[PDB]
Design a protein around this nucleic acid. Sequence first.
DNA 1: CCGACGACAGATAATTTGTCACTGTACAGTAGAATATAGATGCGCATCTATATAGATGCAAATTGAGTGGCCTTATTAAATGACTTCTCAACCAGTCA
Length: 84
Amino acid sequence: QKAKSIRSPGWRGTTLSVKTREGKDLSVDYSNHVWQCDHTRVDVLLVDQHGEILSRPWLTTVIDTYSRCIMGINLGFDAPSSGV
DNA sequence: CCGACGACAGATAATTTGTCACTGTACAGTAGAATATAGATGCGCATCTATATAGATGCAAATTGAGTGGCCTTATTAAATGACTTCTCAACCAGTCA
Ligand SMILES: [Mg+2]
């Protein structure tokens, strides 16, 4: 039960080093140095313009690592794809 | 004189509200979907039915042609016309005369 509950501290102050699958760390020095992206389902069922059920949209977000500002999105019924 | 209860004032923690520091936990591709059933509706194919017969037959008038049966004055003469039958159809010698 303890081994599931373990907390981790966090980056503290203006210094941040993003670890890659290559074992290299990217030193994030300034705005637009490292953007990040992945997808998820939203948790609301939407309806068509007639009020009948469609499906839960997919949300994509692009974030800048240095500022943590949300730099762009895509929201739609469409599937994760290199197009999205 | 002694004991008990109410008025008024004074001090106080419980209650509520606010602020502040530390923290467990979700973000991690994901439940609309699969699998039965009844119940109604529609298209297709078969399985009868009821009507509609024209051809064949039987029969009964309606002539229709072809039969058959029943009823009737007669004898002489004469003429006319048309017919039939019968009969007949020799040849030279002997006695006058101009
Ligand atoms: Mg992802």
